[PDB]
Amino acid sequence: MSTFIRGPICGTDNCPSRLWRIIDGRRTCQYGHVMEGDVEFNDDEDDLNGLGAGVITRRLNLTTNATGSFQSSQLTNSQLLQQQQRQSHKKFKKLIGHEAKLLFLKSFQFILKRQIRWLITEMRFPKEFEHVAKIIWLKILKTINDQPQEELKLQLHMTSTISILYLASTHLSLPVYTCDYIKWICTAKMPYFQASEILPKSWRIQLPNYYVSILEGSISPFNGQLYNKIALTCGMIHFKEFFNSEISCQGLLLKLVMQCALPPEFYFYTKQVIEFEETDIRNLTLWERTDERHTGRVSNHAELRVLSYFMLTINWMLSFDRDRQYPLKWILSLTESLTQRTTTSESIGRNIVKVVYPDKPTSSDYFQWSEEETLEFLKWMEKQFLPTQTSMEMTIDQKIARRKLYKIFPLDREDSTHQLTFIEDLQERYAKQTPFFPPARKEAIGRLLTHIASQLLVDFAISKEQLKDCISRIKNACLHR
């Protein structure tokens, strides 16, 4: 403990306690006896005209009458205050380096897991989807630790997480990429685009030392951007050796035929050309671990080639259907019916993806936006943009002001199921073409192909020419009969 005495103790009895009798004017023994002082000073009368400029003023360097014999204090250096304030304004983050990276690491860790479980709820793909995804990143982590020391090139990127989920899904081979991406954007199924979730509140603050803040969808994918990292992850992963049948899916073909001019025959046509020179009669697999940092026209992005065969098939098939199985007036009817139209969720989604306002292929639909499409758009904004967010501080005043403002314009709401489903729309346009049974048709064919180029290209990293660069590639591949 501290001691007593920093003023007085009763030298009579050894009782080191002190009483104050303010009525007496006396400092006395708390336990025992006597007068600790008869003298008592400063409780002035009725005479303080205050002429005294009394410039002095206490400032704790001349001590004090000590009128508390009660004490404990401590040795002081001289006004903690600055050290006190330094300590109050300390708990923040002020980190950086390996430590910051570990939590940057951690946060990345968590959001992916949150991503995966919505994955299960949406797809109901049992322990299986969950555990494969976990070891996939366990494998990813393995590599990160090795080149540690102070290496802080963890790639990841807003893209890396979905590449991870993508590769894991392919191992399992549940779906597709474009479909997955459009679905995800449309329903914000992924926690992908905003990184505020986590349960970081704190990770947010850990002055995620430059790292973390870089979290949060930062932006939407360009041309490559996303197929490139998948390759990096595979090289990171050595994924092809580890997992079976990657990039495959007779389901992407189905998705694609139904996508539009779904021809109860073009599935087998394109499946056949794929059969053909499409990797020698074999389901093309996940490209490799493009180890090199330059990431060139890998192009063996299997799907990228699937869409290419898809397109090719259509015009080849349709611009030498000698037997005339596909009528002149039939081709434009399909492209016809195609013109825009609502979407039991899908087309509305593709509008939401179009609105990344990229290379201006959908920008104008931006403009046009077929009436309601306009309406169900604002509907999806009032539901799925709300998370939007929650000024912290800056007046519990402006927060209030903001609230008031919102209240003011209160916005929202100052046979049913109109937006029919997907296979409903699909049915009704193949019916809209159900009347089935020279220069112009060539033009029509080109017209139609540009459209699909729009569609397939729009879900994906496009390259208003890589696409065709891609196209060009297999064109060349083909003529070695």
Partner 1 sequence: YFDDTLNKTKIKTYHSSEPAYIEEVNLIGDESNKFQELQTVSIKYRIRRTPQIGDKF
Partner 2 sequence: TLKYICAECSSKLSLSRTDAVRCKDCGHRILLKARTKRLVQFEAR
Partner 3 sequence: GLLNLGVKDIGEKVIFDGKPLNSNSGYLGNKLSVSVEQVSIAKPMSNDGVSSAVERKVYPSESRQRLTSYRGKLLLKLKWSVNNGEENLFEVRDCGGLPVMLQSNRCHL
CA distance 382 to 401: 21
Task: Give 8-12's long-range contacts (Cβ < 8 A, gap of 24+).
Answer: 8/36, 8/69, 10/34, 10/36
CA distance 3 to 416: 84
Q: Which is nearer to partner 2, 381 or 400 (CB)?
A: 400
CA distance 213 to 397: 27
**448 in the Ramachandran plot: left (φ > 0), alpha (ψ -120 to 50) or beta?**
alpha
Q: Is 15 annotated as a binding residue?
A: yes
Answer with the entry of partner 3, partner 2, partner 1, none that 81 interacts with (C-beta below 5 to 8 A by kind). Answer: partner 1
Determine if 77 is a binding residue for partner 1 (CB under 8 A). no
Near partner 2 in 397-416, by CB under 8 A: 397, 400
- Say which residue the tokens 């499946």 belong to: 271
Question: Residue 204 corresponds to which tokens in the numbers above?
Answer: 């947010």
Determine if 402 is a binding residue for partner 3 (CB under 8 A). no
Strands (E) across 17-69 are located at: 18-21, 26-29
**Dihedral sign computed on CA atoms, order 195, 199, 200, 202:** positive
Q: Is 238 annotated as a binding residue?
A: no
Q: Which is nearer to partner 1, 90 or 418 (CB)?
A: 90
CA distance 116 to 265: 36
Q: Which is nearer to partner 3, 145 or 395 (CB)?
A: 395
CA distance 186 to 459: 12
Question: Residue 131 corresponds to which tokens in the numbers above?
Answer: 């555990």
81, 386, 408, 479: which one contacts partner 1 (CB under 8 A)? 81
Q: How many residues bind partner 3 (CB under 8 A)?
A: 5
Determine if 407 is a binding residue for partner 3 (CB under 8 A). no
Report the nearest approach of partner 3 to the CB of residue 392 (Å): 14
35, 66, 80, 400: which one contacts partner 1 (CB under 8 A)? 80
Near partner 3 in 339-398, by CB under 8 A: 394-395, 397-398
Determine if 205 is a binding residue for partner 2 (CB under 8 A). no
Q: Which is nearer to partner 2, 15 or 400 (CB)?
A: 400
Determine if 391 is a binding residue for partner 1 (CB under 8 A). no
74, 78, 389, 417: which one contacts partner 1 (CB under 8 A)? 74
22, 55, 75, 386: which one contacts partner 1 (CB under 8 A)? 22
Near partner 3 in 285-324, by CB under 8 A: none
The answer for residues whose C-beta is within 8 angstroms of residue 289's C-beta and 6 or more apart is 231, 232, 234, 235, 236, 237, 238, 239, 240
Report the nearest approach of partner 3 to the CB of residue 395 (Å): 4
Report the nearest approach of partner 3 to the CB of residue 1 (Å): 43
Determine if 443 is a binding residue for partner 3 (CB under 8 A). no
CA distance 27 to 19: 6
Report the nearest approach of partner 3 to the CB of residue 398 (Å): 7
Report the nearest approach of partner 3 to the CB of residue 397 (Å): 5
Question: Residue 456 corresponds to which tokens in the numbers above?
Answer: 């397939």
Determine if 398 is a binding residue for partner 1 (CB under 8 A). no
Report the nearest approach of partner 3 to the CB of residue 408 (Å): 13
CA distance 463 to 469: 8
**Axis crossing angle, helix 226-237 with helix 157-172, rounded to the nearest 10:** 60
Q: Is 478 annotated as a binding residue?
A: no
Q: Which is nearer to partner 1, 386 or 392 (CB)?
A: 392
Report the nearest approach of partner 2 to the CB of residue 394 (Å): 11
DSSP character string of 164-211: HHHHHHHHHT---SHHHHHHHHHHT-SSTT--STTTTSHHHHSTTTTT
Neighbours of 393 (CB within 10 A): 8
Q: Is 470 annotated as a binding residue?
A: no
End-to-end CA distance of the chain: 97
Site string for partner 2, 357-396 (x = CB under 8 A): ---------------------------------------x
Answer with the entry of partner 1, partner 2, partner 3, none that 417 interacts with (C-beta below 5 to 8 A by kind). Answer: none
Q: Which is nearer to partner 1, 56 or 81 (CB)?
A: 81
Report the nearest approach of partner 1 to the CB of residue 53 (Å): 27
73, 149, 388, 416: which one contacts partner 1 (CB under 8 A)? 73
Report the nearest approach of partner 3 to the CB of residue 401 (Å): 6
For residue 26, list its beta bridge partners: 21
For residue 29, list its beta bridge partners: 18
Q: How many residues bind partner 2 (CB under 8 A)?
A: 3
Report the nearest approach of partner 2 to the CB of residue 94 (Å): 22
**CA 444 vs CA 266, 333, 440, 447, 475: distances in Å:** 18, 10, 6, 5, 21
Judged by the rule CB under 8 A, the positions of this chain that interact with partner 1 are 22, 72-74, 79-81, 84
In the annotated binding site for Zn(2+), the residues are 10, 15, 29, 33
In the annotated binding site, the residues are 10, 15, 29, 33
Judged by the rule CB under 8 A, the positions of this chain that interact with partner 2 are 396-397, 400
